Design a protein around this nucleic acid. Structure first.
Ligand SMILES: [Zn+2]
Lengths: 49, 45, 245, 147, 207, 147, 530, 240, 48, 82, 41
DNA sequence: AAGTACTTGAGCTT
DNA sequence: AAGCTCAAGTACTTAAGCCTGGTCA
RNA sequence: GACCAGG
């Protein structure tokens, strides 16, 4: 009954309700409606500066 | 069984008298007599 | 904290420190710290489906030409002589002083003569830069600068001792807190990079075979040689991708 | 994404700030001196398919889970370009129509191009006697007029 | 402090109770002994002074079957090889069929094989002290056990057309077997008191 | 058009469906598209009350009820009945999955037991618990027959 | 697609949502013969783990039974004839020439039969050729108070086959023994019990067609007085959480916030103290829940008991329980996921919406809103957690019985009961003499303890047992004589079952059985004369 | 009485030397360890083990175990108590001075002593711990672990009314086979009552009375399989 | 096993508690032998 | 082994839940194989309901042998059973 | 002048047989030390 | 992962 | 010496039924 | 036969 649990630090990240019934129940957590996946990195040298 | 073999001896690593005790155990078990099998050990020499 | 750690390494403990480092091109690998009951910590890494197990003081002295006092004041820089850390670091330091060497050169040559066989590096070119190569390739990749690898590894060993020191909770890596998503295209790029590394190493082995036969055609300046070599080896990687998909 | 309260503009955060930020979920729930962030609209919490199940907050969560996992298998319109699709088994629902009850996001994502089922005048009643043990009935005239 | 003098007091209510239960007969007061009753029985200068006189016997109410029983306690820890075999000729002149022994602790294994071989038609049986000092057969989780005559065993073997290898068994390391004086081969008749429907009587053997 | 069963709503907690019924009978009457996103309607005023105001505007009962005469007897049902406008997204399990019959057919190369099909007219499996069932029933002949 | 009847369903354990069943067909005649006789559906009426009946009529039929047996229902000639006939359906089942009816319970000034009169009419028209009438008194499911303080329905009482008083419900006919259908199975034999179950089925069906029954919305809503009662009760439960938590850690309610938070931080780094905390918190919350449910749900809600079509289905036992209407109508209560309660994230704020170290019950897994009115988001997430836990447990459990039924047939493979009446293994060894005295294998031993039942009628049971043919061949006097000798308190007498096997000697019974019949004759001598 | 009841409770329960001891500082150079101990009043609050008991048993067995485990760390590094001073009067400290060669590597001393504390027990019946009192006017004591031998000696409670969670192996070893038989019948009935499902004791009694057919008790795995007369079953079931 | 069909199953209250529905396809396709005697020749005649 | 004599029979005289089944079955099969109908038929067609019509009249052949677990048997006619 | 409990004893004899045979190294008859043997999976 | 029974070596006693 | 019970440690098979689809080399 | 699906 481990990581197949819907432990709450997902609020708005990956949907709590929708995840299939049956064997894979609790594993595949479909992303929330608006949680993107940021894939284009950025420049951050100004951050150490 | 190979471990139990004695190559030069071609008898058992066990004492023959003990293997014959074992033999009597099964001989008397064949007809189904349980306490009668544990009886036969009642000898001390 | 996961039980397999200790009973894999019976001197070992469940206390471990994991880090998933990733180069700028998203070609990540994981190198973890396994702590052992004695007080030393071994610096797990994994190369070519092969486990590998090196002590942290070793790699730490190998990285920078350093003074051991810098090592300690990097580990337990605080509140001078806090008993727990100032004793565990003493024990580790003596334990590595046991059978190791002193200088960066000597340690690097130790490591190089050790690893040369499994590493697919050029059979000849060097052995010192092989040491500066292993610390380039496996220990800590996301950090480009050596000194920064050094500072971060000090951070890491301090945090691990703190973890045994009970002042830090057990992180629960199976939560969306410490979790991330591998997109499709990144895996695609990594598999393409791997198939290309295989292709290069394969034509390398092929030219090595041509040198191995006796010397059937040997002129490394002539182009006709290379078009022949390319003719021999399988030159398709796209079909490998299509089979993958 | 969320809305920042001390300013009035967008702000995005990842899976560290959640555990350490007092993210108010209702404009009226905001308590000052603590709440640093406000959610746009808690609709933004669920997923896509789960969102389009009307009154999804009146159901016992196992049932919303069943309806989610089972709406992903409706015999609905898999699109509109079917002349040029060589897929193996396709299902097309000849007469589908828009739900009379629909969460506005159901129009925003533009599902109306892709309806899934029909709208039936369902009378909750135990009259036929056949419709027990989770079954149901189907008015024959509607079944032959093109349900 | 001085509780050890209770351990051996509670060693006659595990022994004088261990009588019938075999078919014998003993005076009905040696079972209801009060605590100080024993101290009045076995006296000395102490106040420790319990040993050197703890030995009795009994004659069966079976009145036959060759023969009777004699109870004797070797209180000295580690009975050994010089207190097992010397206490056999004393059984032999007494013509007692089977006797008892207690010990705390550890009847030595070297003095555990050589003993049962000379007993022959007699048999020493069996116990040690500090383990069986509370009557076992007295509880809700144990039935009353009864032996069977060869006629009584023939009864079972006939009414069921059985073989003595088809009836359920009891091992001899069992406290109720060593308690009854069972030998390997005789059928005991047990009273399953399970409150489902009445209580019936099952049987078992030993081997 | 479709009769659902009352005894199915408790033990499932799909009261959201009754709310959907109200909403649909409200929307169809006037010509509205009832917005049913989660979390809109709070405890102060129920969604039921809002949709009921709508309905009593339209003309029908306020709890959603409606008087229905039965069909085969002609007299009214003593108690009113519930009629809503739900969205029945048809599912996909009808005939392919359902029925396979094996009178006589192809067999196994090795042991001449019928094959594992539904494409090769394969037989159904009967054993390793079906055996326990009969051999509890005390039907040794049925066991020896089927097995 | 094949078709079956509702009754068998609860046996096969199907929901008929679209699950599928193997149909077989034994070819030869030996096989189908033994099947038709040993395993005909009605002849499997008692599930053999216990005695209670596993078949029964279900949801629509049972609540419409509570609506037909109720005394408020009156039928005229036309409806009564029609309904009785729909219940019987003679020709296809057969066996009868012409149906016989009862006279009307009330006659002037209009002839109106009552419902229980119709249940009695059915019980009559299935009467065997010559078997004396049934009689029974046994408690019903729907407690009487729902009808009235000191109402008489309560317990179904019908002598000589007529429902004098007592409405039928789950218990009377369904998955509950000592009701109608079970005693009919006893007295009249099983091949009649099945026809009876079918007849009550079609009967309540035709009635539903006449009358109708729906689970309509207004059944859920609280009346304004009731709902403000609940809102006041929760206004009082504004704080219970902080009080209980500060009490468990021990600090006062006006405690310093800093010390309170520091204590809480000390609380859930360790885990056993959390089990204590949650025990105390769930204690106080279950108290609050008991309070508000107990005031609201039976009295607050809009419609009363009978006219309410959901409280009917709930309290009758068709589907659901009292907790279901509780959740639907008043509050949901604490959500306990894998035991204790909600899991905390590292920083101690159970959800990112709640401030760190929350003590209000709102973050303890307690949720105030009710399904009808609509649950809030914060609470919704916890409910999702608990529901999903339910699913991932029920899924991953069904593999736990995955090795035991390949364990308990290697060692209980044959274990047949030979004609010596002494259960043996197949090899030949004895395991249980007389099967723990058995009284039977449990599937029929049930009515022994119902010693009042037989003495109540006694005229039909004697004909069932067929005394004239049985007393002939079997021995009676000797074992009955020895029964007393075995009941002698001193020993040396076996249990009578060992001396005289219970097959032929019509005198042996276990001890407790004879003790029961004796101490019943002496304890309850009211029915037996003198 | 209730006071004597709680007295027996604190008696049969084992104290572990850790549960009494406070922080353990080890001053070094030679070699020196100091164990803090709480006041006698709180000491008898939780307890009722006497100061002289601490003195004697602590000294002897604490010494031995510390010796053994420090030898353990020494032998692992390869890959003694000359001075002992207990608080002979006040019972508030315990110092020990030991000498070790300088070549031996540094030792994790505080952890070693913390383990040794938990690794020594004063009054522990072999195989029992954790005695508790729970609410019927038939007051009974819950005990974690099993020692029928230990409960024989205790006459503060009846030697008859000893209810057991199964441990049927143990009681079969010393109470009979019918003991274990009725034990497992009671056990399974108790397991199946906690849910309101009915399992009439005919089936459970047959399951029991077969499970102990041999006269011992056989589990429902490879053990019982190897005994049947059917060479087809045993070959079908687990390891063909 | 042969002679054994399978389907998804709907409920019917009208038949009996004994009886089970059989669709026409299972009837027409599930076969079983019947010896032929003097008195059911008529039925088998109609059958063939 | 032995074939138990009529004078002493231990078995239970009740036509069990099983002997009824097998007796009626094999009898129905017999009568299906053009066998002697020992009772005037009622026009009934099924080769098994004839068997029940016969067993109700207790005019059936086929004594049954009840194997005791020893290896002996008792041979009971169907009329003799209850 | 098979059956169940037979196997219970006939397996006990097998286990005792091994416990006896494999323990001995030198010949009890010959007094020699016949060479040891090493295997592989 | 769970846990089982299996087998070999090192320390103590005659 | 060496016999012989004691200890952790090395090899080693199971994990519900069905049923239906699909892709695959 | 193996990996994703699904009741
Ligand atoms: Zn030799």
């Amino acid at each position: 009954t481990t990581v197949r649990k819907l432990l709450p630090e997902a609020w708005g990240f990956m949907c709590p309700v929708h995840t299939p019934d049956g064997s894979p129940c609790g594993l595949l957590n479909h992303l929330a409606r608006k949680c993107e996946i940021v894939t284009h990195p950025s420049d951050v040298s100004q951050i150490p500066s | 069984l190979l471990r139990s073999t004695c190559l030069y001896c071609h008898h058992f690593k066990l004492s023959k008298v003990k293997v014959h005790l074992f033999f009597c155990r099964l001989k008397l078990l064949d007809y189904g007599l349980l306490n009668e099998s544990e009886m036969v050990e009642n000898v001390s020499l | 904290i996961r039980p397999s750690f200790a009973n894999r390494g019976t001197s070992y403990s469940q206390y471990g420190l994991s880090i998933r480092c990733v180069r700028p091109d998203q070609s990540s690998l994981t190198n973890t710290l396994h702590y052992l009951n004695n007080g030393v910590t071994m610096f797990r890494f994994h190369w070519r489906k092969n486990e590998y197990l090196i002590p942290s003081m070793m790699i730490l002295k190998a990285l920078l030409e350093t003074s051991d006092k810098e090592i300690f004041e990097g580990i337990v820089g605080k509140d001078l002589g806090n008993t727990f850390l100032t004793d565990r670091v003493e024990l580790m330091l003596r334990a590595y002083k046991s059978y190791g060497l002193y200088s960066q050169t000597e340690t690097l040559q130790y490591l190089g003569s050790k690893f040369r066989v499994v590493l697919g590096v050029a059979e000849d070119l060097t052995d010192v830069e092989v040491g500066r190569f292993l610390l380039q390739k496996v220990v800590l990749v996301h950090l480009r600068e050596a000194k920064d690898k050094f500072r971060l590894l000090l951070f890491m060993i301090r945090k691990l001792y703190a973890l045994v020191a009970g002042e830090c909770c057990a992180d629960n890596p199976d939560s969306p807190q410490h979790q991330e998503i591998l997109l499709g295209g990144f895996l695609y790029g990594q598999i393409l990079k791997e198939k290309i590394e295989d292709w290069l190493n394969s034509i390398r082995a092929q030219i090595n075979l041509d040198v191995r036969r006796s010397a059937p055609g040997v002129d490394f300046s002539d182009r006709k040689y290379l078009t022949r070599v390319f003719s021999k080896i399988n030159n398709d990687i796209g079909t490998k991708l299509q089979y993958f998909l | 994404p969320v809305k920042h309260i001390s300013t009035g503009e967008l702000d995005m955060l990842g899976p560290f700030e959640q555990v350490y930020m007092d993210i108010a979920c209702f404009p009226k729930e905001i308590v000052p001196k603590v709440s640093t962030h406000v959610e746009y609209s808690p609709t933004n919490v669920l997923s896509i398919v789960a969102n389009m199940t009307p009154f999804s907050d009146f159901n016992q969560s196992p049932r919303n889970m069943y309806q989610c996992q089972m709406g992903k298998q409706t015999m609905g319109t898999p699109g509109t370009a079917l002349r040029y699709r060589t897929d193996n088994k396709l299902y097309r629902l000849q007469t589908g129509q828009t739900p009379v009850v629909r969460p506005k996001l159901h129009n925003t994502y533009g599902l109306d191009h892709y309806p899934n089922g029909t709208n039936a005048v369902v009378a909750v009643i135990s009259y036929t006697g056949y419709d027990m043990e989770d079954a149901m009935i189907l008015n024959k005239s509607a079944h032959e007029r093109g349900f | 402090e001085e509780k050890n003098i209770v351990r051996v007091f509670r060693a006659w209510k595990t022994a004088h109770q261990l009588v019938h239960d075999r078919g014998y007969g003993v005076s009905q007061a040696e079972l209801d002994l009060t605590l100080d009753q024993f101290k009045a029985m076995h006296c000395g200068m102490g106040r420790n002074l319990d040993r050197t006189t703890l030995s009795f016997y009994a004659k069966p109410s079976n009145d036959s079957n060759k023969g009777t029983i004699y109870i004797e306690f070797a209180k000295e820890p580690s009975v050994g090889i010089k207190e097992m075999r010397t206490f056999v000729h004393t059984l032999g002149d007494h013509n007692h069929k089977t006797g008892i022994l207690i010990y705390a602790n550890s009847m030595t294994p070297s003095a555990a094989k050589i003993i049962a071989t000379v007993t022959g038609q007699f048999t020493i049986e069996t116990f040690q002290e500090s383990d069986l000092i509370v009557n076992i057969t007295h509880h809700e989780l144990v039935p009353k056990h009864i032996l069977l005559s060869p006629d009584e065993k023939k009864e079972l073997l006939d009414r069921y057309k059985l073989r003595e290898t088809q009836l359920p068994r009891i091992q001899l390391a069992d406290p109720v077997a060593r308690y009854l004086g069972l030998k390997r081969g005789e059928v005991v008749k047990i009273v399953r008191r399970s409150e489902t429907s009445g209580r019936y009587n099952s049987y078992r053997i030993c081997a | 058009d479709i009769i659902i069963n009352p005894h199915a709503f408790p033990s499932r907690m799909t009261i959201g469906m009754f709310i959907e019924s109200l909403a649909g009978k409200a929307g169809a009457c006037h010509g509205l598209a009832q917005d049913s996103t989660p979390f809109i309607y709070s405890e102060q005023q129920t969604a039921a009350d809002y949709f009921g105001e709508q309905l009593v505007k339209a003309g029908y009962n306020y709890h959603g009820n409606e008087p229905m005469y039965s069909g085969i007897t002609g007299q009214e049902m003593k108690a009113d009945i519930y009629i809503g406008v739900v969205y029945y997204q048809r599912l996909r399990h009808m005939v392919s999955d359902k029925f396979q019959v094996r009178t006589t057919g192809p067999i196994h190369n090795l042991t001449r037991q019928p094959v594992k099909g539904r494409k090769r007219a394969g037989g159904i499996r009967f054993g390793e618990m079906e055996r326990d069932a009969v051999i509890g029933h005390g039907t040794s002949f049925l066991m020896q027959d089927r097995l | 697609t094949i078709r079956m009847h509702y009754a068998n369903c609860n046996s096969y354990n199907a929901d008929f949502d679209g699950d599928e069943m193997n149909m077989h067909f034994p070819q030869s005649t030996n096989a189908r013969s033994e099947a038709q006789f040993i395993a005909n559906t009605d002849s499997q009426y008692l599930v053999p783990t216990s005695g209670d009946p596993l078949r029964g009529l279900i949801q629509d039929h049972v609540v419409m039974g509570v609506w037909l047996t109720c005394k408020d229902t009156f039928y005229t000639r036309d409806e009564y004839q029609q309904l009785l006939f729909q219940a019987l359906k003679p020709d296809e089942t057969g066996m009868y020439g012409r149906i016989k009816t009862l006279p009307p319970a009330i006659q002037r000034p209009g002839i109106y039969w009552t419902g229980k009169q119709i249940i009695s009419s059915v019980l009559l028209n299935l009467k065997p050729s010559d078997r004396p009438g049934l009689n029974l008194k046994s408690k019903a499911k729907v407690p009487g108070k729902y009808w009235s303080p000191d109402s008489e329905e309560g317990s179904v009482l019908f002598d000589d086959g007529e429902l004098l008083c007592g409405i039928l419900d789950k218990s009377s006919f369904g998955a509950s023994a000592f009701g109608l259908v079970h005693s009919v199975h006893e007295l009249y034999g099983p091949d009649i019990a099945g026809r009876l179950l079918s007849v009550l089925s079609r009967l309540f069906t035709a009635y539903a067609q006449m009358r109708g029954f729906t689970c309509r919305m207004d059944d859920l809503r609280l009346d304004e007085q009731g709902d403000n009662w609940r809102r006041q009760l929760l206004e009082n439960g504004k704080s219970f959480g902080l009080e209980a938590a500060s009490e468990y850690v021990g600090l006062s309610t006006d405690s310093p916030i800093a010390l309170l938070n520091a204590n809480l931080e000390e609380v859930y780094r360790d885990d056993e103290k959390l089990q204590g905390l949650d025990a105390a918190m769930k204690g106080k919350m279950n108290g609050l829940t008991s309070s508000i449910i107990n005031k609201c749900i039976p009295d607050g809600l809009l419609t009363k008991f009978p006219y309410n079509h959901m409280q009917t289905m709930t309290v009758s036992g068709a589907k659901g329980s009292n907790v279901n209407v509780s959740q639907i109508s008043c509050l949901l209560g604490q959500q306990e996921l894998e035991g204790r309660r909600v899991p905390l994230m590292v920083s101690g704020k159970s959800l990112p919406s709640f401030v760190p170290y929350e003590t209000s019950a709102k973050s303890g897994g307690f949720i105030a809103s009710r399904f009808l009115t609509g649950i809030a988001p914060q609470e919704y997430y916890f409910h999702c957690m608990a529901g999903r836990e339910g699913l991932i447990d029920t899924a991953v459990k069904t593999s736990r019985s995955g090795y035991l039924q390949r364990c308990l047939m290697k060692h209980l493979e044959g274990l047949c009961v030979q004609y010596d009446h002494t259960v043996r293994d197949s090899d030949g060894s004895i395991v249980q003499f007389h099967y723990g005295e058995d009284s039977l294998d449990v599937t029929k031993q049930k009515h022994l303890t119902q010693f009042e039942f037989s003495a109540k009628n006694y005229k039909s049971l004697i004909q069932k047992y067929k005394v004239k043919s049985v007393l002939s061949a079997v021995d009676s006097e000797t074992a009955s004589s020895y029964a007393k000798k075995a009941l002698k308190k001193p020993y040396k007498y076996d249990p009578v079952l060992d001396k005289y096997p219970p097959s032929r000697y019509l005198g042996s019974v276990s001890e407790k059985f004879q003790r029961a019949v004796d101490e019943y004759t002496q304890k309850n001598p009211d029915k037996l004369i003198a | 009485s209730d006071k004597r009841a709680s007295a027996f409770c604190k008696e049969v329960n084992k104290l572990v030397l850790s549960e009494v001891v406070r922080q353990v500082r080890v001053t070094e150079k030679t070699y020196a360890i100091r164990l803090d101990l709480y006041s006698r009043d709180e000491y008898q609050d939780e307890y009722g083990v006497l100061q002289e008991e601490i003195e004697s048993t602590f000294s002897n067995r604490f010494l031995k175990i510390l010796n053994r485990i420090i030898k353990s760390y020494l032998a692992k590094s390869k890959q003694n108590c000359k001075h002992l001073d207990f608080d002979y009067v006040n019972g508030e400290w315990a110092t020990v001075e030991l000498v070790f060669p300088i070549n031996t590597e540094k030792l994790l001393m505080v952890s070693l002593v913390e383990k040794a504390c938990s690794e020594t027990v004063i009054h522990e019946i072999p195989g029992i711990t954790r005695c508790f009192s729970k609410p019927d006017t038939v007051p009974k004591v819950i005990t974690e672990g099993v020692n029928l031998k230990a409960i024989w000696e205790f006459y503060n409670e009846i030697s008859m009314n000893d209810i057991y969670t199964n441990d049927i192996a143990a009681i079969l070893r010393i109470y009979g086979v019918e003991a274990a038989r009725n034990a497992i019948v009671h056990e399974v009935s108790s397991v199946f009552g906690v849910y309101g499902i009915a399992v009439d004791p005919r089936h459970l009694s047959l399951i029991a009375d077969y499970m102990t057919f041999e006269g011992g008790y056989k589990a429902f795995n490879r053990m019982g399989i190897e005994y049947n007369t059917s060479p087809f079953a045993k070959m079908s079931f687990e390891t063909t | 096993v042969n002679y054994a069909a399978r389907s998804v199953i709907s409920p019917d209250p009208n038949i009996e508690t004994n009886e089970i529905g059989v669709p026409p396809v299972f009837a027409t396709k599930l076969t079983y032998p019947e010896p032929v005697t003097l008195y059911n020749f008529n039925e088998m005649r109609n059958a063939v | 082994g032995k074939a138990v004599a009529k004078e002493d029979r231990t078995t239970t005289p009740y036509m069990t839940k099983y002997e009824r089944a097998r007796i009626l079955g094999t009898r129905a099969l017999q009568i299906s194989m053009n066998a002697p109908v020992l009772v005037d038929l009622e026009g009934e067609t099924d080769p098994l309901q004839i068997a029940m019509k016969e067993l109700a009249q207790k005019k059936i052949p086929l004594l049954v042998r009840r194997y005791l677990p020893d290896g002996s048997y008792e041979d009971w006619s169907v009329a003799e059973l209850i | 002048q098979l059956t169940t409990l037979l196997l219970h004893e006939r397996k006990k004899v097998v286990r005792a047989f091994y416990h006896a045979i494999s323990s001995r190294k030198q010949c009890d008859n010959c007094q020699s030390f016949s060479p040891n043997f090493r295997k592989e999976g």
